[PDB]
Design a protein around this ligand. Structure first.
Ligand SMILES: [Mn+2]
Length: 664
């Protein structure tokens, strides 16, 4: 077990991060957040007539529109793969209590029996190769940072200039400080450079849940959310328990007294964590160029834009295999850290910085108020941290890790069960070089698309495919997973970033095609996550700028879903059945007001010039900036609002900085 030390919230270390101000001390002292999101301004999540609108919506429509994914998990028909009832929650009120994150799933990795290192030593070499290349050619470019992004841990300053001082001083003595950590002087850099420190628990909120109608009596059973307690946590999955949080709304018919219409539970309380940036500066400064690298040197498996972007790569394929990933974060191996740091150093990457990683990569955490009468438990010991808490959200390069080991285990498994004889062209580390290059160049029969956990796969004429069918079959059975690092199933109802690949009768990659999910659109409408906090002059702080945009963008967006317009029918209809009015004109006017609001926000798009400057994708990024923090990469935005969203960082300081960090 070995508890990760449970220091009281009160601690000087707890202070050193925070600016010891308003939001700082408050966040230290923060109570459990709760509150209906103003799901539309002038419209919370709680309106009962709108709740009946959900009622008609998910009921009458799922009724009319049952899912069309086949046995293989490959998709046909309407292309629905999902209950519409995932709307049906307190989508402003979280399902409570909450999990307590572990410190070591290593035994949990020994339960899923996830491997402690290489399968074959060849595989080791493979690891070393992906590492070899992700740690290879570099063309540094100026770093950039979100405007209005709170410094979070440490100080929680909203000021950009804070982030400036932090990141720049980090550019100045990350060497000295990472050395201090190598010297073990964690708190010295942590209290002078204020580098590193801790994570702060926050929430992702699953907007939906797998509500399941009961034919025999109409029960609406959302998927249960098994979660750890503090003991299951500190005793790395050892003691403690795994358990659903209460889904009930009557507990707010209790507490809030709020009326409880059918099927309306409460959104899942997934938990991200914030953390110090000064080390994330080197992270973006390289990875973002590395992002650009693989997107340039390769893309292919890597480029992510239009469904077209992907589809074109796909229908090509004789065979295609959407992936399905178990708890994507927690499962990341620490021996993987071992090889990371290994070949970092082997390839001259800066040992102090390497120490900086391992610091962050096992950085101490903190729990706020997971339930009322819970948390405010400081965790870990920033003097000898040892956490194996899995992929903490504070890193942005975690995506690199996911995309990594996933692509690994994918391709590997393809060797394992489709192309072992072909491993013969993988004679060594250099062979792994030409190869991996070529595979991310795609000049291979076995194939993939990848983005963190989400991924797919591909195959062709040439002497390897039938085993692809086989491995396909086994995984489709899922009866045993060959993967010793992950529980990777096929996703029945598989998709890639909401690109729901469709199949026809032939069920082929060349058959039917991706669609932008329309149910997902419904989510965008009604089951997203955040409110805006309208009580601020600038929307830059606001979680969710301009929803009306998505309205207009809808065909341009998820009109990729064939049945699109019928969805329009249903929405407008059900709204006339709801508030008895024009959600049409409603949302139109919301769009108009979006243009109004943005109008003063924007200059070069002179007055209300029109929205022609913004890509429909960037339009998606403007109704939805938020996924840019966990979907869109930064460069994607057109430079205008890109800068409205982001601010530049000096190329030079970062340059020489990398020159230090890089083996030159
Ligand atoms: Mn998808």
């Amino acid at each position: 077990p070995r508890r990760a030390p449970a220091f009281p919230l009160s601690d000087i270390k707890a202070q050193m991060l925070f600016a010891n101000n308003i939001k700082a001390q408050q966040a230290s002292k923060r109570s459990f957040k709760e509150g209906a999101i103003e799901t539309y301004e002038g419209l919370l999540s709680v309106d009962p007539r709108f709740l009946s609108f959900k009622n008609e919506l998910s009921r009458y429509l799922t009724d009319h529109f049952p899912a069309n994914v086949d046995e293989y998990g490959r998709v046909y028909g309407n292309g629905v793969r999902t209950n519409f009832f995932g709307m049906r929650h307190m989508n402003g009120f979280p399902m409570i209590p909450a999990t307590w994150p572990l410190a070591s799933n290593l035994k949990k990795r020994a339960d899923a029996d996830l491997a402690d290192g290489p399968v074959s030593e060849r595989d080791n070499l493979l690891f070393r190769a992906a590492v070899r290349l992700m740690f290879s050619d570099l063309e540094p470019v100026p770093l950039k940072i979100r405007k209005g992004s709170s410094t979070c841990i440490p100080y929680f300053s909203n000021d950009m200039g804070t982030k400036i001082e932090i990141a720049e001083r980090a550019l100045e003595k990350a060497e000295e400080a990472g050395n201090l950590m190598l010297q073990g002087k964690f708190d010295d850099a942590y209290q002078l450079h204020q580098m590193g420190g801790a994570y702060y628990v926050v929430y992702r909120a699953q907007s939906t849940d797998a509500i399941t109608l009961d034919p025999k009596t109409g029960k609406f059973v959302s998927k249960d959310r098994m979660v750890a307690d503090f003991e299951y946590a500190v005793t790395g999955g050892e003691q403690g328990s795994l358990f659903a949080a209460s889904k009930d709304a009557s507990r707010l018919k209790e507490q809030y007294g709020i009326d409880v219409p059918d099927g309306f539970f409460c959104e899942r309380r997934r938990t991200a964590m914030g953390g110090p940036f000064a080390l994330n500066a080197p992270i973006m400064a390289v990875a973002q160029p590395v992002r650009n690298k693989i997107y340039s040197k390769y893309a292919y498996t890597f480029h992510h834009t239009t469904r077209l972007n992907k589809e074109e790569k796909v229908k090509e394929w004789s065979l295609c295999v959407a992936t399905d990933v178990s708890d994507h974060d927690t499962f990341w191996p620490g021996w993987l850290r071992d090889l990371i740091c290994d070949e970092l150093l082997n390839m001259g990457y800066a040992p102090w910085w390497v120490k900086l990683f391992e610091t962050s990569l096992k950085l101490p955490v903190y729990v706020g108020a997971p339930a009322p009468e819970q948390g405010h438990t400081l965790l870990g010991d920033p003097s000898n941290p040892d956490l194996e808490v899995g992929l903490s959200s504070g890193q942005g390069a975690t995506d690199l890790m996911g995309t990594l080991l996933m692509s690994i285990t994918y391709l590997v498994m393809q060797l394992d069960h489709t192309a072992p004889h072909l491993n013969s062209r993988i004679k060594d580390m250099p062979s792994a070089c030409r190869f991996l290059d070529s595979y991310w160049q795609g000049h291979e029969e076995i194939r993939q698309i990848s983005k963190s956990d989400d991924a797919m796969l591909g195959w062709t004429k040439g002497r390897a495919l039938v085993g692809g069918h086989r491995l396909f079959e086994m995984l489709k059975e899922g009866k045993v997973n060959p993967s010793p690092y992950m529980k990777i199933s096929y996703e029945h109802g598989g998709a890639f970033l909401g690109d729901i690949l469709l199949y026809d009768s032939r069920r082929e990659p060349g058959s039917a095609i991706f669609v932008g999910n329309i149910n997902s659109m419904l989510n965008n409408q009604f089951s997203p996550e955040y409110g805006v906090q309208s009580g601020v002059r600038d929307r830059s702080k606001r979680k969710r700028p301009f929803p009306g945009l998505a309205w207009a963008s809808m065909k341009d967006t998820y009109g990729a879903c064939p049945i699109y317009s019928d969805v329009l029918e249903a929405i407008e209809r059900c709204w006339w059945n709801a508030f008895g009015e024009s959600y049409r004109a409603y949302r139109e006017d919301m769009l108009k007001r979006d243009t109004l609001e943005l109008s003063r926000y924007v200059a070069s798009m002179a007055r209300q010039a029109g929205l022609a400057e913004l890509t429909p994708i960037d339009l998606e990024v403007l109704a939805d900036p938020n996924k840019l923090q966990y979907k869109w990469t930064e460069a994607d935005v057109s430079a205008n609002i890109h800068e409205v969203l982001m601010h530049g960082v000096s190329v030079e300081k970062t340059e020489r900085f990398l020159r230090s960090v890089m083996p030159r």
